[PDB]
Swiss-Prot record, chains A, B:
Belongs to the tRNA nucleotidyltransferase/poly(A) polymerase family. Archaeal CCA-adding enzyme subfamily. InterPro entries: CAA_C (IPR048833), CCA-adding_arc (IPR008229), CCA_tRNA_nucleotrans_2 (IPR042090), NT_2-5OAS_ClassI-CCAase (IPR006116), NT_sf (IPR043519), NuclTrfase_I-like_C (IPR011068), Polymerase_NTP_transf_dom (IPR002934), tRNA_NucTransf2 (IPR015329). Homodimer. This is CCA-adding enzyme. Catalyzes the addition and repair of the essential 3'-terminal CCA sequence in tRNAs without using a nucleic acid template. Adds these three nucleotides in the order of C, C, and A to the tRNA nucleotide-73, using CTP and ATP as substrates and producing inorganic pyrophosphate. tRNA 3'-terminal CCA addition is required both for tRNA processing and repair. Also involved in tRNA surveillance by mediating tandem CCA addition to generate a CCACCA at the 3' terminus of unstable tRNAs. While stable tRNAs receive only 3'-terminal CCA, unstable tRNAs are marked with CCACCA and rapidly degraded. It comes from Archaeoglobus fulgidus (strain ATCC 49558 / DSM 4304 / JCM 9628 / NBRC 100126 / VC-16). Mg(2+) binds at E59, D61, D110. One of its GO terms (biological process) is tRNA surveillance. Gene3D superfamilies: Archaeal tRNA CCA-adding enzyme catalytic domain, Beta Polymerase, domain 2, CCA tRNA nucleotidyltransferase, domain 2, Poly(A) polymerase predicted RNA binding domain. It is an enzyme of class 2 (transferase). The gene is cca. Keywords: ATP-binding, Magnesium, Metal-binding, Nucleotide-binding, Nucleotidyltransferase, RNA repair, RNA-binding, Transferase, tRNA processing. CTP binds at S47, R50, H133, K152, Y161.
């Protein structure tokens, strides 16, 4: 309905509501009042400070700015003493070093100790870049705050906003960089139609060029890829979404898709038509944070996938899901049942000693020569992909992630058929099979 | 029971019987009387002339020796005019050029026109080497005639005597060369335990060395591999049989194996236990000679084998059989049924035009991105190896040998299960699956 008018409407899906802005205003006035009362040097950073934050994602970040001659333990103790005193409630989470993540008057706050520094090239972590991120962006992003939100909003409605490992999408900083680079949401989208897996966006040089991987060069530090956590597949998806948008623009690109919620009977039909084996490994969710869990689920599900390939069950795709209590590793394979008999490779006919060993083993059928080499018929211990994985998970849990493996060691189940539809996995199965609306 | 005594007993399985020797004597006296009466220059060649021939394989070869100044058509006409006049019954078969293959007093004779030549390096075909083969071997093989028979006999009882393509084993000439080289049957066997696929036996140099393939150098012509038609797998088998013989010698190595002749019920059990798909392609045998048929059956059966591999039915082995009326191509596959759905590869996400084409095709499920590339779920047209081959043989018969293909084009059948056991293939199936006695 004309791009200019669709963007206007999306601004209402994207700009946070009234009581949200003023909920942040008073948590920002309370927090100032507490820190000011204590004499701490501080700075508000992140997207709240710049009025670029998405509707629904209100977060205040405050960095404590402590003189360059403070030790690595003295800043770690003192910095958290102020975080106790300033927050309604406090805890010590870790991004790399400890930092207080709590609440003030109903609003998430992160308090972070870090060196007071003028000029970068004098920093230690991802934490010490942040004040410089903010400084670099403040003023350049003025007038363009709504563009950022439109971009964050576009990404979020399509499941690719957030650099955390559950998402492996676009961070807020990345979105603000992009807007500074291209000028607007719409120019970002138009230009991203030509991005490749080798595109280097060098923001500080005003330059796009080719290199080895997708890389957005941090204007604060030229060694840092701001898009380091963006996965290749989400880059691909973004590029394609940008092409689709410019081809037939629509408000629905800023709305989440009315989900599938199909009933067991359609799924039964679909599975029957496809003629695959569909099953899940179920086990108890380890009590670790997301950024630790999701890489483990990815590795577990990859390991089982490779086992199934190697064992000739021809896996099509796999997926994984964490619920409150359980995790699920989900698979679909082209082979529902393989023969009991298989070929085991023996030695070249020349190698007398080793042929003798190969021929010693008692078997039910006679070995044979083919293309100059011995081979023997031997028997598999499992004939379905479900039995295979029972066996693999029982024996090779050690390879399925530190905590994922240890949980599976304690308890796991293979689920197929009508039982698989009693678990909260239907949505994931549908997506994994490309089920249409 | 001691090697020396086993060899003595085998000599009775190997040296032709009494009425066989004198059946050849009188066919050799009749034939001389006919050619002598006509004034033809001739020479008896082959293993009859040297008393090296196996029990059961009585064959007289006579080569007509015509002056060096005879044309290539004048020797072809005249040479066959004498073959009509000398044989009870005559026909013109082809090894490379025409030659009369008929009978005299109940005995196969080949009459062959060829140039009368002193010194080789003045020859045209495999035919002109033969007189020189005989000349080179006559005198060197005296006293060792029984050794040759023992060797021919050992090879024949194990299915590897004959260079013709149904066998791809050891020719008579090769066996006589081997005996001259090593001196005896037993030294041939002892030394062949060390043969490799790279062994060069250079008879005229009294030398064994390494080269690129198994090669027995013709003492008459150094470019000629006397073992050219020996297959790698039969070489392998011979080597292994020679090892087994020296390890536990026995008369039974000169006897054929009391065959399996298993009944349908055991085969049903075995197939059930193995859990494979076992089937055959049946069709009418083309009316061509063996050396033409068997390479075609090998190619047809290889082509279907590769189709089944490529289509993920995981073929274990294949075999083929010609009966009087039908041929059979036999297969065993690990996959009895595959899913209807499969992954079709699309383009890299970057390639806008080609992604658009890939995404245009109407399908039942949505395509998806994985590792930077598009993929689509699509549907197979067959889900069992039997259906696959119905389809392949109906469409790609042209690739299955000139005559084999044309017959299959006219009529073929896929046979499975109880029907497969109504055909004369059981012995071949058993061997292909390594069924034990
Ligand atoms: Mn924060
Ligand atoms: Mn940075
Ligand atoms: Mn002959
Ligand atoms: Mn020769
Ligand atoms: Na196991
Ligand atoms: Na076809």
């Amino acid at each position: 309905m004309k791009v200019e008018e669709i963007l206007e409407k999306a601004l209402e899906l994207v700009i946070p509501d009234e009581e949200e802005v003023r909920k942040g205003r008073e948590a920002e006035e309370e927090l100032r009042r507490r820190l000011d009362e204590l004499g701490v040097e501080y700075v508000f950073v992140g997207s709240y400070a710049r009025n670029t934050w998405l509707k629904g994602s209100l977060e205040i970040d405050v960095f404590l700015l402590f003189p360059e001659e403070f030790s690595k333990e003295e800043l770690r103790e003192r910095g958290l003493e102020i975080g106790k005193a300033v927050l309604d409630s406090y805890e010590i989470r870790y991004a790399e070093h400890p930092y207080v993540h709590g609440v003030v008057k109903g609003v998430e706050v992160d308090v972070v100790p870090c060196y007071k520094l003028k000029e970068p090239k004098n920093i230690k972590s991802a934490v010490d870049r942040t004040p410089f991120h903010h400084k670099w962006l403040e003023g350049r992003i003025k007038g363009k705050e709504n563009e950022v939100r439109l971009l964050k909003g576009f990404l979020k409605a399509n499941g690719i906003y957030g650099a955390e490992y559950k998402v492996r999408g676009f961070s807020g900083y990345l979105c603000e960089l992009l807007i500074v680079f291209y000028g607007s949401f719409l120019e970002t989208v138009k230009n991203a139609r030509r991005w490749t897996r080798r595109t280097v966006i060098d923001v500080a040089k005003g330059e796009v060029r080719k290199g080895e991987e997708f890389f957005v060069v941090d204007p604060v530090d030229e060694k840092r890829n701001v898009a380091a956590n963006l996965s290749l597949d989400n880059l691909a998806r973004f590029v394609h979404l940008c092409r689709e948008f410019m081809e037939a623009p629509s408000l629905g690109f800023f709305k989440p898709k009315h989900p599938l919620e199909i009933e067991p009977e359609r799924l039964r039909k679909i599975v029957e038509e496809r003629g695959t084996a569909v099953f899940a490994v179920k086990f108890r969710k380890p009590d670790i944070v997301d950024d630790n869990l999701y890489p483990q689920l990815e590795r577990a599900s990859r390991k089982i996938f490779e086992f199934l390939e190697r064992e000739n069950f021809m896996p099509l795709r796999s997926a994984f899901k964490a619920s409150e209590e359980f995790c699920y590793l989900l698979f679909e394979c082209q082979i529902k049942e393989i023969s009991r008999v298989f070929r085991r490779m023996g030695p070249q006919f020349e190698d007398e000693r080793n042929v003798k060993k190969f021929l010693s083993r008692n078997r039910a059928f006679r070995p044979f020569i083919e293309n100059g080499r011995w081979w023997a018929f031997e028997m598999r211990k499992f004939t379905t992909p479900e039995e295979g994985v029972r066996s693999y998970a029982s024996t090779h849990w050690h390879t399925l992630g530190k905590n994922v493996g240890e949980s599976i060691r304690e308890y796991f189940e293979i689920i197929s058929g009508e039982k698989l539809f009693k678990e909260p996995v239907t949505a994931e199965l549908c997506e994994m099979m490309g089920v249409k609306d």
